[PDB]
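Box 3.1. Reading complex inputs
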Amino acid sequence: GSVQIVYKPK
Amino acid sequence: GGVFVQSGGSLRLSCAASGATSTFDGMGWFRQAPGKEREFVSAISYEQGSYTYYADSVKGRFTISRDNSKNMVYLQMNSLRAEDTATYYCAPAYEGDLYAFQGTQVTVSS
């Protein structure tokens, strides 16, 4: 399917 | 339309949090300011003491919390500044990363 990922802090 | 806050003011956001599944172990927030990329804000685990992540831009000002009895997550936004102007989105988390498969617009004056 599809997804928007917003990554946690580096 | 959206929320309007004076600089130095505060705001609390809330979102339903159904609870941990095999896919997700927490909930958090990201934001998108006009003409900018999505920015991580904060994420919290359903498990007490597992993660509590914050963007460096909000550390000390924002506090994420959860109430597993109420199936709710909260974001307390204190000492707001004009750079916090954005639309805020809640999303399920897996190890702190947010997965979005309905925002709150917030304007802060300086």
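In summary: Chain B touches chain A through 18 residues (CB under 8 Å).
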